Ligand binder design. Structure first.
Ligand SMILES: OC[C@H]1O[C@@](CO)(OC[C@@]2(OC[C@@]3(OC[C@@]4(O[C@H]5O[C@H](CO)[C@@H](O)[C@H](O)[C@H]5O)O[C@H](CO)[C@@H](O)[C@@H]4O)O[C@H](CO)[C@@H](O)[C@@H]3O)O[C@H](CO)[C@@H](O)[C@@H]2O)[C@@H](O)[C@@H]1O
Ligand SMILES: OC[C@H]1O[C@@](CO)(OC[C@@]2(OC[C@@]3(OC[C@@]4(O[C@H]5O[C@H](CO)[C@@H](O)[C@H](O)[C@H]5O)O[C@H](CO)[C@@H](O)[C@@H]4O)O[C@H](CO)[C@@H](O)[C@@H]3O)O[C@H](CO)[C@@H](O)[C@@H]2O)[C@@H](O)[C@@H]1O
Ligand SMILES: *[C@@H]1O[C@H](CO)[C@@H](O)[C@H](O)[C@H]1NC(C)=O
Ligand SMILES: *[C@@H]1O[C@H](CO)[C@@H](O)[C@H](O)[C@H]1NC(C)=O
Ligand SMILES: *[C@@H]1O[C@H](CO)[C@@H](O)[C@H](O)[C@H]1NC(C)=O
Lengths: 512, 512
């Protein structure tokens, strides 16, 4: 329950990634859109008292109108005793007052209900609560709990309105049984078990499930996508998110196939949840850290940001050369309401060790982005050189420039990050992986030449990569030395002839 | 046509992990046991002409009687033209001469047939060949190929005798279709397609499938285990091996569940195949490297070792605290026929920063092993110290000691490796991951205290870890600076009080 005189925001706090002002944030909760206030809501696992996870545990709260300018508000929910906690959960908007909390004086689009896990010593139940003031203060049902199965491991329900079966659906995790459980109710108070679902990578625990209809691109058609988070025992170490693509009738999810696929192959993307009430598309964000080392990272007086919100679709994409697969695609949310401080733009440039691309901006905000489409040429080079790299350098402090690398190796058809930074030591950095990669097929062939694309956005302590137009995404935090934060960006290579042609490049400085 | 005057065997060549004398080895092939010659056979993807994969491509050959003393022989098989290559494949012993290559003058346990992929420009077929001299020289069938489906991506068949359906089974990969294909035949020459199987992690390509009956421990019973290799696009990067546990009838494999589980969560364990004719148990080995950087590692004039052979069983193990899962267990093969040069043995020792455990041996062979059971005590310590570490140090050369770390963090319940070594730079080391971890549940509770176990064996350039009696295995290569190789081994910690009790410890110097 510490805190104090040390503040790293100067070089550590992201600008456009939500962050609690002080304390501890994990799982994002109760994500919804308020159509009449035209307002986006975000709640979160919050321990105000400590720089680490502890009880009592609360739902934090903050709103946005644009999904990058967050305003923090007073806590939406707390537990009865210091002994307990309001765990993960969701929100729904009860338009037709099936729940009966709702007067005639309350806008249908403001009839908010939260379903959350109530965690007691030796007990975990599914409880609900309602807000009369547009989501800012809540009243416990009164006959809570609404679901109790005598379990110590039963938590994190996402709830939604299924037209087709005419009910409220609940995906909640029977955590250590590796079941996602599917309840139905016409009521939000009375619940009937419909089915259990076990699949994908098991890890140590199922958690924060999610089920939602995601639109196939360029088409009337859609599919039903089951999200699932697992910690610990991610094959990458710690925590991760995964999905399955199939069909829901309101009683059981049937995956089209039985493959395992991950939502984000970065290290720091856990407890993804989608927004309720989104008119057009599927939108979500996650908790942008890994349970292996989240509580030891060198930020103070808060810890943890969220990811950007992302737009989710399904696209037929090439996973090898012969076969395409229906595949979850995600792209970041950036409204024009974001200042461009300065930018470097370039067209049809050949990359060689004598033509680097050096950002030369006046000063820095630590919020950059980069948008690149490239062609891989026919030119044979020695194996050490079949790569180009983006270096994201800090300003020189103790006469030393902290940098992180993002490259692509044509011989490997795979992008890569190296987030190693020397002299920055914190507890559990044995699990803080420095090198990760993603294999991708060409976005396109221009003749015989291969074409790849990548958008990345750096934010003081977090970096998001989207490969080939959002075919794979890779979230990862990074910790530079005290006082240092991104200043400039380079795109370099060791080859003397051009191996890569950059069709388009746009490096941007950004702001609030 | 490179090779020359540079030889690293002095500090790089493993002693008990098979290695070709010179050239390039990947997938191990045709693994079988010769009951009459009481002799173990290993074949492999071999390019004798280069330090990298190239055609013409051959099956190499070597035998052993103890599975750690390897004798290299003349090539067992080659292609017709420099244009082509004998790809991966297996061997069976045709006892009852169903194939008809076999006289009365040939021992039933020497009636060898190889089934291998014949790779032609634009064609890949399933071909077969027999040996009359106990596996040393082969004759192509004559009406080869025996399976052709007009495919450019159709390779790597494992074959076996199914009593219960009275036929020869073939698991072969339709590589870019993500199908494992199951053919049956009474003949080995005529083949009928029985089923297709698609599951687990897809990656870019299915490869080197395997199906076999593995015995459940302490029981009459067994299960049918489907192995699969995938490269590229292992979630860890590059290449990896995975499995599924279910039931075979001779026509289709049905997995009990639909989960994804990996055979070795290390970075260098691909193209696992099991031995034919083993009387008692399932035994196998893999190619001990990753396709991301195998051809760039600093070993000359060979590249690549195999793993040790391992004994494979299924055990009920706790994956969280509530649930156990039927789980592939693997432990290493080490006959007593292995010299113990020297050893340090210890009992019930409390670990603290002042009581380290330093190996003090006369000199070094670079072949060490270590066998450790431990208890995690009730003692609260600052977060940076909840770990202990095994340091595997080289001798000091340019006044610098190359080391690789293997630890366990009690707060994480997870083991870890850090194979970083400074100043050693080679092509594609961007993909050469340095930090990897494995989360495990206790092996046993002694009272309330937790008990974990780990055997690891180092061999000049490779390290194999088996956690909690073979519940998870982690294979990884390592490349120390020119001339440097393991010399001594420490077990240290930073804590002042004992956090770990080492029930038993046995560090060993080993030899041929
Ligand atoms: O907020 C509840 C909510 O989150 C979800 C989704 O993640 O699950 C949380 C869950 O696991 C958290 C976990 O790690 C916590 C961690 O440290 C905290 O806990 C310790 C005591 O348990 C404290 O000593 C420490 O100071 C706290 O900060 O545990 C490690 C310490 O060994 C640290 O590395 C982590 O930061 O808790 C267990 C216990 O360690 C871990 O295995 C998890 O990774 O939280 C409860 C129990 O904490 C567990 O049931 C959940 O998995 C979601 O399911 C809930 O809705
Ligand atoms: O020998 C066939 C046998 O092995 C298996 C099981 O692994 O399949 C191997 C397979 O993929 C090989 C792959 O890596 C090779 C690699 O370099 C070699 O190949 C290139 C020729 O295409 C050369 O450029 C290079 O110099 C050779 O050393 O490819 C990369 C070069 O970019 C290097 O990183 C590797 O060392 O080849 C493709 C293309 O890169 C990779 O994606 C693979 O990892 O072999 C063929 C093609 O080589 C492919 O069909 C196989 O999947 C087994 O299935 C076979 O029975
Ligand atoms: C689902 O699991 C619950 C909890 O184990 C159990 O009571 C119920 O039998 C299951 N129902 C179905 C349909 O599988
Ligand atoms: C990046 O470039 C493409 C090409 O114009 C553009 O459509 C896209 O919106 C840009 N920004 C992002 C975040 O993808
Ligand atoms: C398996 O897939 C192949 C590829 O077309 C097809 O010919 C075959 O009919 C399928 N067989 C079965 C039994 O499903």
């Amino acid at each position: 329950s510490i805190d104090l005189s040390v503040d790293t925001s100067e070089y550590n706090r992201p600008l456009i990634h939500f962050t609690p002002e002080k304390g501890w944030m994990n799982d994002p909760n109760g994500l919804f859109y308020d159509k009449t206030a035209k307002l986006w809501h975000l709640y979160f696992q919050y321990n105000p008292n400590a720089t680490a996870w502890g009880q009592p545990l609360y739902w934090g709260h903050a709103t946005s109108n644009d999904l990058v300018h967050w305003d923090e508000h007073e806590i939406a929910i707390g537990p009865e005793h210091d002994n307990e906690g309001i765990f993960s959960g969701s929100i729904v908007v009860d338009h037709n007052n099936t729940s009966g909390f709702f007067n005639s004086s309350i806008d249908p689009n403001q009839r908010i209900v939260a379903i959350y896990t109530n965690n007691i010593p030796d007990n975990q139940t599914q409880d609900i609560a309602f807000s009369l003031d547009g989501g800012y203060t809540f009243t416990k049902y009164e006959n809570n709990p609404v679901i109790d199965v005598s379990s110590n491991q039963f938590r994190d329900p996402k709830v939604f309105w299924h037209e087709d079966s005419n009910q409220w659906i609940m995906v909640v995790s029977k955590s250590q049984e590796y079941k996602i459980q599917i309840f139905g109710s016409a009521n939000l108070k009375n619940w009937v078990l419909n089915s259990n679902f076990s699949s994908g990578y098991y890890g140590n625990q199922y958690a924060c499930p999610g089920l939602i209809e995601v639109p196939i691109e360029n088409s009337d058609k859609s599919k039903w996508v089951m999200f699932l988070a697992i910690n610990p025992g991610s094959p990458l170490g710690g925590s991760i998110n995964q999905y399955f693509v199939g069909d829901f009738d309101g009683f059981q999810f049937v995956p089209d196939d039985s493959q395992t696929r991950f939502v984000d192959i970065g290290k720091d993307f856990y407890a993804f949840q989608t927004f309720s009430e989104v008119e057009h598309g599927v939108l979500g964000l996650a908790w942008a850290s890994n349970w292996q080392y989240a509580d030891q990272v060198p930020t103070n007086p808060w810890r943890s940001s969220t990811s950007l919100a992302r737009n989710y679709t399904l696209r037929y994409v090439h996973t090898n050369a012969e076969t395409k697969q229906l595949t979850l695609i995600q792209n970041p949310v950036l409204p024009d309401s974001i200042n461009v401080v300065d930018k470097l733009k370039k067209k049809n440039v050949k990359l060689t060790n004598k033509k680097p691309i050096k950002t030369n901006f006046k000063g820095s905000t630590g919020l950059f982005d980069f948008n690149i489409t490239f062609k891989v040429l026919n030119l044979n080079v020695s194996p050490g050189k079949t790569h180009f790299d983006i270096l994201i350098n800090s300003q020189e402090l103790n006469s030393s420039v902290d940098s992180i690398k993002i490259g692509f190796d044509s011989s490997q058809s795979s992008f890569y990050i190296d987030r190693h930074i020397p002299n920055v030591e914190f507890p559990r950095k044995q699990f803080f992986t420095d090198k990760l990669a993603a294999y991708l097929e060409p976005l396109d062939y221009d003749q015989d030449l291969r074409v790849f694309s990548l958008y990345g956005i750096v934010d003081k302590n977090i970096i998001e990569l989207y490969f080939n137009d959002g075919t794979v995404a890779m979230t990862n935090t990074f910790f530079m030395g005290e006082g240092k934060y991104p200043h400039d960006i380079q795109i370099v290579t060791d080859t003397e002839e051009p191996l890569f042609e950059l069709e388009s490049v746009i490096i941007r400085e950004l702001n609030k």
